[PDB]
Amino acid sequence: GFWEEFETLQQQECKLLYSRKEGQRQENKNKNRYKNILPFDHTRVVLHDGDPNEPVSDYINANIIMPEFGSSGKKSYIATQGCLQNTVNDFWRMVFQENSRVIVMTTKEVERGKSKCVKYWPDEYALKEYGVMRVRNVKESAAHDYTLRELKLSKVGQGNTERTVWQYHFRTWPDHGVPSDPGGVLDFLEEVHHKQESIMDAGPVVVHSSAGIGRTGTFIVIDILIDIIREKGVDCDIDVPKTIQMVRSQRSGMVQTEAQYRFIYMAVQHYIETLQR
Amino acid sequence: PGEYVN
């Protein structure tokens, strides 16, 4: 039962209470959108190469999520919150350092009067410097449910560091609850998957939401489960609770609501039914 | 910073 399964998961959280001390440091307080939502220390993305005048330059509210313990970076994700005004530069340091080539944005910049992500990309055709990083917005391609932005990211002053980063911005997720059917998300995730698959040396896919746990966990868990079906077929074992437990061992609270939990099952079933057609 | 309870 969906209701019983999600409740059992919500109770099991007491054994994934790993340290979150770095995000609790005074220097990092203003780098978190939400005081209570912090990365586990052992899976957090540690930022190197920071300004040597900054006493703490190694922190972003983000964790690596591996679907399996041996996963390559190309098969992994970074779950993170939407940028704050003061973390846009750190976000691009993270994207560059981790060799990420695909970003999945699951919110608008603002929903119901609240900032869910400060704009971290230039206007179409424009060039912006974000700290030491330079970003050109080469082209935007607008679909029904999402916009794709082809971004070119490089380190200022250093040639031959340029790489293309593809930002898939899902724009129609409802302000409350979840989409009433998963077709839009499934089509979006299919494009994300093929783009990531096509890039030889790609690092983890960056996925973000206001806190980096609810919509972020929903998209990541759907993506993991559909990839199992890609490899193993429509009759394979699918274990939604165990997959949620795996991602929750790497960032607290992934998948926040019962509607999200039901949406994951619905997305997987629709993926299966399109294949069977 | 605030509190995410969704």
Side-chain angles (χ1 to χ4, degrees), chain A residues 73-88:
Chain A
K74 181 168 184 175
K75 277 310 233 290
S76 303
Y77 309 84
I78 289 164
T80 192
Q81 66 184 18
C83 296
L84 296 160
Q85 184 53 68
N86 55 311
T87 70
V88 169

Side-chain angles (χ1 to χ4, degrees), chain A residues 42 107-108 133 136 180 187 228:
Chain A
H42 69 291
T107 65
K108 295 182 185 74
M133 299 300 173
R136 169 81 73 186
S180 66
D187 284 1
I228 295 173

Side-chain angles (χ1 to χ4, degrees), chain A residues 196-216:
Chain A
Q196 175 74 354
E197 201 63 32
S198 73
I199 304 166
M200 172 54 60
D201 195 26
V205 174
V206 176
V207 182
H208 65 93
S209 59
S210 191
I213 61 173
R215 299 182 201 179
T216 292

Side-chain angles (χ1 to χ4, degrees), chain A residues 57-68:
Chain A
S57 63
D58 73 338
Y59 180 86
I60 184 163
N61 195 318
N63 297 87
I64 297 283
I65 313 290
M66 300 181 299
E68 310 272 11

Side-chain angles (χ1 to χ4, degrees), chain A residues 4-6 8-20 22-28 30-56:
Chain A
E4 182 275 319
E5 287 188 352
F6 192 64
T8 298
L9 288 169
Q10 298 289 79
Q11 311 163 172
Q12 286 173 357
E13 285 286 51
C14 62
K15 269 174 237 269
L16 303 166
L17 294 180
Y18 301 119
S19 177
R20 300 167 304 141
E22 293 298 309
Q24 293 169 325
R25 291 174 70 178
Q26 201 74 28
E27 293 89 344
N28 293 328
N30 288 324
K31 301 169 187 171
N32 301 313
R33 182 170 279 98
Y34 302 102
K35 193 185 21 181
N36 62 317
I37 305 292
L38 300 177
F40 291 137
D41 287 332
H42 69 291
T43 57
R44 78 182 180 93
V45 181
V46 179
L47 297 182
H48 309 296
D49 198 39
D51 184 347
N53 297 285
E54 207 51 60
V56 181

